[model samples]
Target chain A: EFKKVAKETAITLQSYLTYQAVRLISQALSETNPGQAIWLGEFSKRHPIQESDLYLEAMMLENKELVLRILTVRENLAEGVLEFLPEMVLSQIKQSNGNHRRSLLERLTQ
Target chain B: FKKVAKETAITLQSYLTYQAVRLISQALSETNPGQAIWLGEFSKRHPIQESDLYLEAMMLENKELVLRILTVRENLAEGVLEFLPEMVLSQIKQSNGNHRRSLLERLTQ
Candidate 1:
């Protein structure tokens, strides 16, 4: 039952994450969020993963490895959010810890 | 003379109030869960409306506010963050409002 609830929540969250990703990427292109937009552009160039892979990863709840991988991708993007913006802006945006950051960075590099 | 100056200030204030409210509406619709899902589904169903009305709305509002602050020589990094109000800005950065907000609140403290 707990797993079922988590699976459902994960599925919803994945959909939401996908939606945010599309929006964030678009915002990065726009003038308002230009720093973010450029960062995302760099990220996509570096990673070379397909958007379809993102969609698939989002939907795969049973696969812990895949779910973790997806979370890693999200964290990398979040780091980009900090890097592109100034410290003042970075402070305003939330921060993540070393363990979480390392996991995300490692998965992204892979 | 001075009367005209006073009248102009009042007019400007009124205009700013109206614009601010309009901008907030646009920003909220794009990022708000209920509205975002509706718009997202709508665009998904249409399949050609890739313009992403909700996201565009929020971005445009951010653009307008950032530009306005910049005109006054404000440091956008600070001011933009301030303008967004932490709740909304954090949401914008995260994967979604729900998970992002909780994670952000935890990290902040």
Candidate 2:
């Protein structure tokens, strides 16, 4: 029942965040566990970003190396990094809002 | 959950009366789009139950009413009615737990 509830919640969040890019989805997904993968995939399939590919440029500029480095470092350090990052950057790249935070587990999973 | 609930309740009461006054004032104006719809809808389709009316009033997109209802509900849950104005306290006592809880949760905004 808990899993079902969690999945349903994830689906609802996915629908709301559908217009977001793959990068944003990936960032949001990293905050949660594998349990949310089904919802994430289902959302991607439904809202497949197509048009002028506005997110593509932003995604390309994303420093994956920086993200990985931050993740690989010590636990507190990673938390510090996120805390130090600009609010706009955090809001845009990561869905750290209340409902989104409740849906995720460790930040890595999201 | 208990700690969070307590903290939420405390935060809620501190702002209750002010919020209620704001809601009443805003509702009087009918200038707010959300408030206008809520008034029209409630008068048009009055709920079958008083509790339902309270719930509907809380849900009214009128941000002010929503905020006020939340404050009252939270105060009720935390047993902090002494801090609230007399009229507000009376309203809290009149509300059912379900309606009260719904209002409390909505205040998390």
Candidate 3:
């Protein structure tokens, strides 16, 4: 195995949202549902990452078509991750102790 | 009505719709996964086109809608709604004077 460079990159909200969706789903599924999570993790690797300010330009120009395309990608990825969120939440809640549950309720109320 | 203001209102309305979808998707995704994907895909399939904004724009006046949209934007990045003033300014330029003042106050507050 070889080490690769880790560099910071600027990304648009659209791009960032896609990445966030991938991160959330993959991590949530990794512990209990490793098989499905593996597929998503691999899917993320296959996708090339490119950054741009074109979304901003599109906004300034009022290019609804272009903006909508970006929104659709974000929407789809979010939907995909959302499919398993309930299972993940239930699992975590069940795993926690009474103290933890109380703390969560306390935080929610606040 | 000035053409620019009309166009601005329509554009902002589309954005408000998009923001609404975002708020609904996020809420359902966390609290009720059963409906999250359905809402997201339905929104994608029914992309706004034509003068439907004229009909849909009325939702902008709804209290919950405006609050939800504002909450989502504010949560995403505090003070981001500062842009609302500029956009709303142009939007009111083409409208009734009484409604204009109320609309301006509603958003800017």
Q: Rate the local accuracy (lDDT) of all candidates.
A: 0.37, 0.34, 0.38
The candidates' DockQ values read: 0.03, 0.02, 0.02
Candidates sorted by DockQ, best first: 1, 2, 3
State residue A49's C-alpha deviation in candidate 2, in Å: 63
Candidate 2 local lDDT, A7-59, one digit each (tens): 33223222222232233435555676445545445544644433212222222
> Compared to the true structure, candidate 1 yields what TM-score?
0.23
- lDDT, model 2, position A95: 29
Q: Of the candidates shown, which would achieve the greatest TM-score relative to the real structure? A: 3
Per-residue lDDT tens digits for candidate 3, residues A30-64, read: 88678866755554454432332332232324333
lDDT of 1 by residue, A1-110 (tens): 12332233233333343434444445545776576556545544644333424543333323333333445455444333323323432332222122333433465477
Q: Which segments of model 3 are wrong by more than 4 Å?
A: A1-110, B49-82, B85-109
Give stretches of model 2 more than 4 Å off. Answer: A1-110, B1-34, B47-49, B52-68, B72-80, B83-109
What would the TM-scores of all predictions be?
0.23, 0.19, 0.29
Candidate 3 local lDDT, B1-109, one digit each (tens): 1332333333333443354456566787998786676555545555643214321342333333333443443232222222333332232222223333443464457
